[PDB]
């Protein structure tokens, strides 16, 4: 006979993310095989792990992806930027674009550099990473105390700087609004330790290219909605 039942309070509801299937309408259909197509993707982290280029405002569009070393300097890093993924410099990189669609991230960012200039030149650079503080460090003396390393021009013109992950919480927010300790994580800067020696007959002013990507232990947790602004 009939089986007694009791419908719950949430009957006839429609959920846009309910983990369940639906009844088929036109089933029993075969499809051609696709074993001939190589390069199948499984996780977007595979694409996130690929280096890309950054942007910079340039002197007064002007968003060249490289920074040019001046001749005379004044006690100040050549270029510095925060470590907030919502910053403009991260807009077009794959890591920034992908992360913008998720709430929480976790892991180590990766930065890579490369030199472009005359072969027979020489110089030395210093890279720094300063955790959050009351004021952004400026002088080389301040910079030296924090974590840093020294880059020397030689046979190999590329160098990778790994930004350690330190925070009071296991995860961190991806976009910053109040600049709380949960989103901002300090600054990065580049300082010219020595003066670059341009060999004779090589005109002047070499250039540096910035390469950014995700570390080997990156991760994202919560999906969110997108911004359709690109259509306008």
């Amino acid at each position: 006979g009939p089986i007694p039942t009791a419908p719950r309070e949430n009957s006839l509801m429609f959920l846009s993310t309910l983990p369940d299937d639906t009844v088929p309408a036109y089933g029993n259909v075969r499809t051609p095989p696709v074993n001939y197509l190589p390069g199948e993707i499984t996780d977007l982290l595979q694409l996130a792990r690929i280096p890309t280029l950054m942007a910079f405002e340039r002197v007064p569009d002007t968003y060249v992806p490289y920074v040019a070393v001046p001749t005379q300097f004044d006690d100040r890093p050549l270029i510095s930027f925060p470590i907030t993924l919502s910053d403009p410099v991260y807009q077009n990189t794959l890591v920034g674009a992908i992360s913008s669609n998720f709430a929480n991230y976790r892991g180590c960012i990766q930065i890579t550099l490369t030199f472009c200039g005359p072969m027979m030149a020489r110089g030395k650079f210093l890279l720094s990473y300063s955790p959050p503080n009351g004021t952004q460090p400026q002088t080389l003396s301040e910079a030296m105390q924090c974590t840093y390393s020294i880059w020397d021009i030689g046979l190999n013109s590329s160098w990778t700087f790994v930004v350690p992950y330190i925070s009071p919480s296991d995860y961190r927010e991806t976009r910053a609004i109040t600049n709380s300790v949960y989103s901002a994580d300090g600054w990065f800067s580049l300082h010219k330790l020595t003066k670059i020696t341009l060999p004779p007959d090589c005109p002047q002013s070499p250039c540096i290219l910035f390469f950014a990507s995700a570390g080997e232990d990156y991760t994202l947790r919560l999906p969110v909605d997108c911004n359709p602004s690109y259509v306008f």
């Binding site: 180590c108 503080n133 009351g134 004021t135 301040e142 350690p164 330190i166 925070s167 009071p168 296991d170």
Partner: protein, 267 residues
């Protein structure tokens, strides 16, 4: 009833003692490095493995029931309140971003058998009494004129803690309650000891590390607050003795540090 605890190059003696209260868990000393960071941390060493000492205001008959004083930790080190000077510990604190440590304190008084009264000391966690209602920490000069904080309905209701002004767009509500009230009748819930004038002179507590994250910012954390309150007002025969004094000692345990940088500065 006679014991001494030795640490680093300093020691403390107790002519009278009931023991040490171990708080929530046995052996609070045990701990492990945090998990919200990768850079190698800095651990304990002899320079900081030692005690520190400070002073409090005096106790006078004029004080009434339930008045109290508070000493935030580790903010006391930074503020140099009561003459406490952390030295090496303060120097290391100012040069780091993340910290995690326990605490272990003791309070002593010089009451004699010819006095009557009682004192209560407890480690209230996650409280804000140092800040003025305006939203600014109480300065050392301001802390002198008023020796003891006067209990009042405002503090009892938690109606005067720091807040954010809404602005001209809205209308000003009537504030009546907040989640940081103070309930004098229930302070004994936290670990405590009664400093009676006829039973003992020194009390001591041992507490572990707590917090809503595996590690907390080293420039703003206020997890533990030391609170001293008066239950029975002091009274004695005239001409015998006047206004005893108070002191306390602190010592961190199994700390960790992360995020090296230059000296902290504001602006």
């Amino acid at each position: 009833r006679v014991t001494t605890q030795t640490a680093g190059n300093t020691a403390i003696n107790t002519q009278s003692s009931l023991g040490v209260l171990c708080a929530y868990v046995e052996d609070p000393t045990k701990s492990d490095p945090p998990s919200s960071s990768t850079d190698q941390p800095t651990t304990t060493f002899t320079a900081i493995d030692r005690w520190y000492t400070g002073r409090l205001n005096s106790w006078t008959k004029a004080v009434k029931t339930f008045s109290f004083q508070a000493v935030p930790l580790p903010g006391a080190f930074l503020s140099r309140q009561g003459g406490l000077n952390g030295g090496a510990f303060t120097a290391t604190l100012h040069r780091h971003f993340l910290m995690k440590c326990g605490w272990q304190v003791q309070v002593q008084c010089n009451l004699t058998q010819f006095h009557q009264g009682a004192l209560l000391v407890a480690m209230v966690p996650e409280t804000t009494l140092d800040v003025k209602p305006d939203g600014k920490a109480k300065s050392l000069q301001e802390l002198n004129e008023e020796q003891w904080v006067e209990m009042s309905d405002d503090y009892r209701t938690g109606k005067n803690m720091p807040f954010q002004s809404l602005g001209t767009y809205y209308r000003p509500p009537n504030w009546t309650w907040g989640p940081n009230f103070i309930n004098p009748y229930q302070v004994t819930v936290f670990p405590h000891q009664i400093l009676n004038a006829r039973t003992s002179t020194s009390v001591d507590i041992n507490v572990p590390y707590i917090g809503e994250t595996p590690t907390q910012s080293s420039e703003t954390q206020n997890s533990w607050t030391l609170l001293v309150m008066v239950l029975v007002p002091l009274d004695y025969k005239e001409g015998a003795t006047t206004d005893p004094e108070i002191t306390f000692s602190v010592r961190p345990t199994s700390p960790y540090f992360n995020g090296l940088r230059n000296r902290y500065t504001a602006g």
